Amino acid sequence: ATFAQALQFVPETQVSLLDNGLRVASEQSSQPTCTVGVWIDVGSRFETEKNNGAGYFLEHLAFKGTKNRPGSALEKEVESMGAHLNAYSTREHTAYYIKALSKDLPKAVELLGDIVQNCSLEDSQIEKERDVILREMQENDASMRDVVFNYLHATAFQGTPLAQAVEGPSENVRKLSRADLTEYLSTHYKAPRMVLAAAGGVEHQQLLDLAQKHLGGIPWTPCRFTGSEIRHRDDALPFAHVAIAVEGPGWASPDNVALQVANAIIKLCQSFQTFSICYAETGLLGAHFVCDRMKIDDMMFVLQGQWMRLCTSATESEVARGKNILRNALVSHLDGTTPVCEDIGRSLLTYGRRIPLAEWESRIAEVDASVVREICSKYIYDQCPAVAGYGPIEQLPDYNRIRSGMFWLRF
Amino acid sequence: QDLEFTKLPNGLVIASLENYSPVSRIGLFIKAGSRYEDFSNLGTTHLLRLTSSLTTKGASSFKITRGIEAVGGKLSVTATRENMAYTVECLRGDVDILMEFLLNVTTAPEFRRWEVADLQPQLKIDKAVAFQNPQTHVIENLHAAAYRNALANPLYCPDYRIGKVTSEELHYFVQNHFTSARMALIGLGVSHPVLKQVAEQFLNMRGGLGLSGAKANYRGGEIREQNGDSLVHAAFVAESAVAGSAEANAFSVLQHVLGAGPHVKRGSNTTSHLHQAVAKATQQPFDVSAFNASYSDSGLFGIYTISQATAAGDVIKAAYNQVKTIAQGNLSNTDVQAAKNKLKAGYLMSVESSECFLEEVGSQALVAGSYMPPSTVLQQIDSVANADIINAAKKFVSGQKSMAASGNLGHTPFVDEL
Amino acid sequence: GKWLDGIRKWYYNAAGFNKLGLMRDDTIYEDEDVKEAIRRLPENLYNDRMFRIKRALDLNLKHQILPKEQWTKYEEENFYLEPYLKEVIRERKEREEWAKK
Amino acid sequence: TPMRKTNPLMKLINHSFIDLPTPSNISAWWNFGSLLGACLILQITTGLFLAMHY
Amino acid sequence: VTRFLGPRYRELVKNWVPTAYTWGAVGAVGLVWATDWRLILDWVPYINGKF
Amino acid sequence: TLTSKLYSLLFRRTSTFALTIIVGVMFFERAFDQGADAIYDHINEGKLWKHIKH
Amino acid sequence: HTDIKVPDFSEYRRLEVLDSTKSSRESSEAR
C-alpha cells in the first residue's frame, strides 16, 4: 500500500544473546540464498602505532588457513559449496561474511567459527602476505580518491588514533611479527565484541543453534578534530582531487538524519559527491570533488555557497526533495541479502538494536527546513574545516580563504 | 506471490509481482539493441540511451528531471547487444508520475536537434569511462572480430560517429524498433491491476512488429591493438550454442568448470583449473577466466586472460591446453558437481537484488514470453551430463577461433597459432 | 690555489644561501638563458631544485634558518646548472656571431 | 563563478588586489610601496582641505 | 516581479528578516553615533556628557 | 559557560557582530574620552583655565 | 601513499586551559 504500510511489512530481525556474549541476529525471508557473517567491533582506531596494520594483515591471512583445515582445504570447501567468502575492514569495524545457499547455512556458520576462533597463522603464509601487502600498497597508491580520503582522515584527526590508515605504514607491515597478530587476535576478537548476523532464507533458531555449536568457544571475557589541511602537489596528474570536511556527530546522534537530508540537498565539477562518514563519537561531513587545474576555486566557491545557503536559507521544497531522496536511498540500499546482513551487523555494532525502517521514516518526517538550517548552522556554519588536496593543487584557495568562505558577511 | 506473463492484444507482454518492498520498480524492456542497427546508423543506440532525460512530446526535459528528483525515484537506461531496458524506481505512492515520464520517454520522444547536438559530446566521455576497465574494451573488439553482420556492432558509438548522429536517425530507430510486440512491461512492487492500467496507457504504441533483421554471421577474424601497456588482455573465443538451449547450459557448466571468477576474497582459485595451470605457466600476476556469452542467434565461449606481455603467449597457451584436456575427456565427476553448485548459487544470488531480478524477468519475457521459475533453471542445470560438457569442449577446441588482444603484443600468438 | 680556495670558502660561508639549504645554482638570476637551462634540466634535478627553492622561501618567510648540520657544504656542492647554462650561452653566442657576419 | 570574477571592475580589483599572486617570504620593506600610495591619498585629502582656505 | 510571487520567496524573506532587522539597527546606531544626534543620545543611560 | 551563550548570541551572525561592535564603539568612545580628559586634566592641574575660571 | 603521518603540531596548538569534560565543539567555540 502506502510507504508506511510497506515499511510495516518489513520483517523484524530477531536478536539473541549467548552465554559468552555473542549477539546472534537474523532476518527471516523467503529467499533461497543467505549471507551469514561475523562483525567484530575492532578496527584501525583501536590499533596503536606498533600494530597499525594488524587488522588488515589478519583480514588478509584469515582465509589462508585455519587450524582445523589448511587454507587450500578451506577455499576448496567454499568453492565446492558455491558460496563466496568475503571480508572487509574499516577504521572501526571488521567483517567476515559468506554469501551461500540456504541449505548450506550450517557448514558456512561452522566455517566462520574456524575463521575466527582458531586461526592458523602460518609463518610462510605470513611472509607471503607481507610480500602481497607490500605490492598492494603501491598498487593502491595509484587510486587518488582513496589517497585523498586517507589524507583527509590523517589531517583531520592527527594525534587521535582515528587518523592512521587501515592498511598501516610500510615499515609497520614489514616489522609486524606473528606474536603481534596473535596478541591482537587475543585482545580484540572476543565476545561480546562480536555479532553473528544472517539474512535471507535463515531461521533464527537454526542460526542460534549453529552459533552455540561453532561460536560458543570464544572466550567469555580522546578523539579530537583539528581543522588542518594537507596538499600533495603533483602537476603530472591529470585532474586535482579535493576533499573538504567538518566535524560530524557520531553514530549516536539524532542530527545524523538532518545532515543526511542536507547532503542529499547538495556543473563545474566533473565529479562531485557529498559524504557523511560517521564514527563512534566523531565524524566527517563534507564533499569530495575532482577538478581541472583551472577550476578548483570556482568549485570550492560553489560548494561553500551551497553550504551557506543551507545553513541560512533552507526552503521547504528543497528539504522535502532531500527527505524523499534519503528515503529512496535508504530503502534501495537494503535490497539484497548482503546489504541487509551488513546493516544488521553494523547497526548492532554502532546503534544497538536494528533501528527498523518505520523509525527511520518517522525520524525523516520529523525533519523540517527550520531543523535542517539549524543543524547545518550547528555543524557547518563558521567551523574550521579539514582539507585534503591531491595535485595538481595550485588554484585551491589557501586555508585562510577556505575558512573565510566557511561564513557569510551578509548573514 | 508469483508472476504471470499476461500478453496484451497489441503484443505488450505485461508481468507484475507483489514484493512488499517500499520501493516500486518498473521496467520497460524493448527488443531494440545495438545489433538491430546497421552501418548506416552505427552507434545510434549509444546516444539513444543517453537521451532519456531529453524533452518529450508530453513532458519537458526540465520537468522530467525535476519531477524525478523531487519524487526521489531514478530513471535509468541499460543496454546490451539485444535488449534495451528503461528502469524506473520510485516510492509506492509515487508511481503514476514516473510511469507517465516513462511513457513520454519511450512512446513519443521529441529529439530536438539542438538538444541532441548538445548531448552528443557526452558520448566521448561515456565511451572513455566505460573503456577504463580493459574487459569492456577487449570484449568490444572481440565482438567486432568474431561476428560480421549483427553482433559486431559496438555498444558504444564509433569515434567517427560521435558528432554525426542526427535526430532523424534516432526517430527512425525508435519508430522502427520501439514497437508494442517487441516490448515487455514488468512491475515488481506494482500490483497487477495498476500495471494493467499503465499498460493500457501503453496500449496505442506504434505498430505490431519491427525491422528485425540480420543473422550475426560468424567470422574467424582477429583484432590486434598494439599499445604500450605492460599488461596484455587477450580473449580468444569459439561459437557456442544459442541462448536458451541445453548446449548453452553445457557451455555455462563448462565455463564454471574452467573457472568464471573468484570465490574467496584474495583467493588463489584452487578449484579453477585455468588459474592453477597459469600459475605454473607464469609467475607474474595474472587473471584467467572462461568468457561465455549467449544470444538469440549465436553464442561465444572462450578464454579471457590478463597477463604480462612478456609471458602473454605462454599464459593463453596454458589456458587453451586446459580446455583441450577437458576435450580429451579428462573431466572427473567431483569438479563437475562443484561447477554445477557454483552455477546454481551464482544464478540464485544474482536474482537476489530486485534490479537483477527485474532484468532477468524482462529478458525472459522478451525472449520467451513465459516466466521460467528458478527451480526449472536448477533442474535444467542438473540435467547437463558429463558427456554434454565434453561435447561442448570438443566444439570449442575444433571450432574456428576469433581473438581480440590489447597491450604490448610482442609475444601474443595470432589466431592460427592459437 | 690554497689561499684562493680559502678565500672562496670564506665567501661561500659568508654568503648565507647555504644556511637555507640552497646550492649556488639555485641563487643564479633567472634570465632567459637561465630559464632555458632550467627547462633543459632532467626531471629529477628540476624537482630537487624546485623543492630546495620552495624550502628556502618557506624558511625566509619564517625568518628561520636550517639547522647547522643541514647546511650545504662548500666541499660537497654540485654545479648541476653549469653545463646546461654554458651550452645555452654557447648556442646564443654562436647565433649572434652568425648574425653579425 | 563568484561575482568578483564577473563584473569587469570587480574583475580588475580581484585580479590586481584580492587574488594577486604574491611571494610569501616578502619582508616588511615591500610594505612601504603601499604606504606610499596611502601617503599620496593623505596628501590629496589633507591638502585639499588646506586649499579651501589658502 | 511576477516570478518572485511564490511561497518559496516568502519563506526566504521570513528567513532573512532577522538579518535585515539587525543590519537596520547597525545602520541606525552607526548614524546616531557618527552624527552625535543627541536627540536620541539623550535617552541612553550613559553617554550623557552633552550637558 | 560564558562563551556557550556569548558566541552563540553575539559572535555567531556577523550582523550581530557588527551591532555589538557599534554599541561597544559608542560606549568605548564615551568612556575612553572621559578617562583621557581626566588624566590630562590631573597631570597639568592648575595650569588649565577651566580650573582658573572658578 | 600510506605514509600520511602528519608531523607533530603539539608545540603550536593553543594551550588548552584544562583537561576538563569540555566538548571539542565548546573548545572550538571558546577559541
Mapping DSSP onto H, E and C, the string for B357-383 reads HHHHHHHHHHHCCCCCCHHHHHHHHHH
Q: Closest Cα partner for B22 from A364, A317, A333, A29? A: A333
Cell numbers at B284, concatenated: 607474474
Cell numbers at B390, concatenated: 565434453
D-proximal residues of C, 23-62, CB under 8 Å:
57-58, 60-61
Cell numbers at D32, concatenated: 612601504
- B263 and A60 within 8 Å at the Cβ level: the answer is no
Quick one: E45 exposed, middle or buried, by C-beta within 10 A (0-12, 13-18, 19+)?
exposed
Q: E48 phi and psi, to 5 degrees?
A: -115, 35
Quick one: CA dihedral B330, B334, B339, B340, positive or negative? positive
- Distance (Å) from the alpha carbon of B113 to chain A's nearest alpha carbon: 22
Full DSSP string of B1-53: -----EE-SSS-EEEE-----SEEEEEEEES--GGG--STTTTHHHHHTT-TT
* Spatial separation of the C-alpha atoms in residues B341 and B334, rounded to whole Å: 11
The approach used to solve this structure was: cryo-EM
* Spatial separation of the C-alpha atoms in residues A271 and A262, rounded to whole Å: 19
* Spatial separation of the C-alpha atoms in residues B73 and A321, rounded to whole Å: 11
β-strand pairing of A194-198 with A23-26 = parallel
Beta-bridge mates of residue A286? A245, A275
Tally the residues of chain F: 54
- A247 and G24 within 8 Å at the Cβ level: the answer is yes
- Distance (Å) from the alpha carbon of F28 to chain A's nearest alpha carbon: 24
Residues B281 and B315: beta-carbon distance below 8 Å: yes
Q: How many CB pairs under 8 A join E and F?
A: 32
**Does C have 3 or more CB contacts under 8 Å with G?**
no
Residues A2 and B91: beta-carbon distance below 8 Å: no
3-state secondary structure of A22: coil
Residue for grid cell 597459469: B278
Residue type, B407: G
* Spatial separation of the C-alpha atoms in residues B28 and B84, rounded to whole Å: 8
Residue for grid cell 577504521: A91
Residues A227 and A384: beta-carbon distance below 8 Å: yes
Residues B371 and A108: beta-carbon distance below 8 Å: no
Quick one: CA dihedral F41, F42, F43, F48, positive or negative? positive
Residues A340 and A348: beta-carbon distance below 8 Å: no
3-state secondary structure of A291: strand
Residues A278 and A256: beta-carbon distance below 8 Å: yes
The answer to whether residue A85 neighbours chain B at the CB level (below 8 Å) is yes
- C58 and D25 within 8 Å at the Cβ level: the answer is yes
Beta-bridge mates of residue B307? B232
Residue type, B1: Q
Residues B28 and B185: beta-carbon distance below 8 Å: yes
Task: Work out the number of other CB atoms within 10 angstroms of the CB of residue A39.
Answer: 27
**Closest in G8, G9, G24 to A225, CB measured:** G24
| Helical residues (DSSP H) of B131-231, grouped into ranges | 134-146, 167-177, 192-201
Q: Closest Cα partner for B296 from B380, B395, B215? A: B215
β-strand pairing of B401-407 with B222-226 = parallel
Q: B271 phi and psi, to 5 degrees?
A: -70, -35
Residue type, B179: T
The answer to whether residue B171 neighbours chain A at the CB level (below 8 Å) is no
Residue for grid cell 580588475: D12
Provide the greatest CA pair distance for chain F: 53
Alpha carbon separation from A124 to A129, A178, A179, B220 (Å, rounded):
9, 11, 14, 47
Q: What is the DSSP letter of D3?
A: G
Q: Closest Cα partner for B221 from B284, B162, B283, B142? A: B142
* Spatial separation of the C-alpha atoms in residues B361 and B359, rounded to whole Å: 5
In B, minimum Cα distance to A75 occurs at B264
A interface mutation test: which of D6, D11, D19, D24 has the most A CBs within 10 A? D19
Q: How far apart are the first and last CA of chain E?
A: 51
Beta-bridge mates of residue B147? B218
In D, minimum Cα distance to C55 occurs at D25
- Give ∠ CA A76-A81-A84 in degrees, rounded to 5: 80
- Distance (Å) from the alpha carbon of A410 to chain E's nearest alpha carbon: 8
| Interruptions in chain C after residues (C–N over 2.5 Å) | none
User: Pseudo-torsion of CA B268, B272, B278, B284, nearest 10°?
Assistant: -20
Q: C86 phi and psi, to 5 degrees?
A: -60, -40
E-proximal residues of A, 316-355, CB under 8 Å:
316-317
* Spatial separation of the C-alpha atoms in residues C73 and A341, rounded to whole Å: 64
The answer to whether residue A365 neighbours chain B at the CB level (below 8 Å) is no
* Spatial separation of the C-alpha atoms in residues D28 and F53, rounded to whole Å: 51
Q: B30 phi and psi, to 5 degrees?
A: -100, 140
Q: Chain D residues with CB-CB distance to C under 8 A?
A: 23-25
Q: A275 phi and psi, to 5 degrees?
A: -125, 150
Task: Work out the number of other CB atoms within 10 angstroms of the CB of residue B51.
Answer: 23
Cell numbers at B206, concatenated: 506504434
Q: What is the DSSP letter of D22?
A: -
Peptide bond into A238 cis (omega under 30): no
Task: Work out the number of other CB atoms within 10 angstroms of the CB of residue B12.
Answer: 21
β-strand pairing of B287-289 with B401-407 = unpaired
* Spatial separation of the C-alpha atoms in residues B379 and B21, rounded to whole Å: 29
Residues B139 and B147: beta-carbon distance below 8 Å: no
Cell numbers at C56, concatenated: 628556502
Residue for grid cell 519511450: B106
Residue type, A109: V
In A, minimum Cα distance to G13 occurs at A226
* Spatial separation of the C-alpha atoms in residues C67 and B111, rounded to whole Å: 70
Q: Closest Cα partner for A75 from B144, B271, B386? A: B271
* Spatial separation of the C-alpha atoms in residues A146 and A201, rounded to whole Å: 35
3-state secondary structure of B417: coil
* Spatial separation of the C-alpha atoms in residues A10 and B21, rounded to whole Å: 8
Cell numbers at B416, concatenated: 592460427
Q: How far apart are the first and last CA of chain D?
A: 50
Task: Work out the number of other CB atoms within 10 angstroms of the CB of residue D51.
Answer: 8
Alpha carbon separation from A329 to A168, A322, A407, C26 (Å, rounded):
33, 10, 30, 56
- Annotated catalytic residue, options A59, A77, A110, A136: A59
| Resolution of the experimental structure, in angstroms | 3.0
**Closest in E23, E29, E30 to F15, CB measured:** E23
Q: Closest Cα partner for B257 from B153, B385, B87? A: B385
- Give ∠ CA A132-A134-A139 in degrees, rounded to 5: 90
Q: Closest Cα partner for F33 from E47, A73, C86? A: E47
Residues B24 and B92: beta-carbon distance below 8 Å: yes
The answer to whether residue C4 neighbours chain D at the CB level (below 8 Å) is no
Q: How many CB pairs under 8 A join C and D?
A: 8
* Spatial separation of the C-alpha atoms in residues B224 and B238, rounded to whole Å: 17
In Å, how far from its chain's centre is CA A328?
Answer: 20
Q: From the CA atom positions of chain A, what is the Rg in Å?
A: 23
Quick one: B230 exposed, middle or buried, by C-beta within 10 A (0-12, 13-18, 19+)?
exposed
Q: Closest Cα partner for B102 from B162, B59, B159? A: B59
In Å, how far from its chain's centre is CA B408?
Answer: 28
Quick one: A160 exposed, middle or buried, by C-beta within 10 A (0-12, 13-18, 19+)?
middle
Residues B23 and B71: beta-carbon distance below 8 Å: no
Number of alpha carbons in the 13 Å side-chain half-sphere of residue B169? 21
* Spatial separation of the C-alpha atoms in residues B262 and A75, rounded to whole Å: 10
Residues B306 and B137: beta-carbon distance below 8 Å: no
Residue for grid cell 647565433: C95
Question: Which helix (H) or strand (E) segment is B107 a member of?
Answer: none
Is A59 known to be catalytic?
yes
Q: Closest Cα partner for B23 from C18, A329, G26? A: A329
3-state secondary structure of B402: strand
B200: Cβ contacts below 8 Å, ≥ 6 apart? none
3-state secondary structure of E39: coil
Full DSSP string of C18-85: GTTT--HHHHS---HHHHHHHHTS-HHHHHHHHHHHHHHHHHHHHT----GGGS--GGG---THHHHH
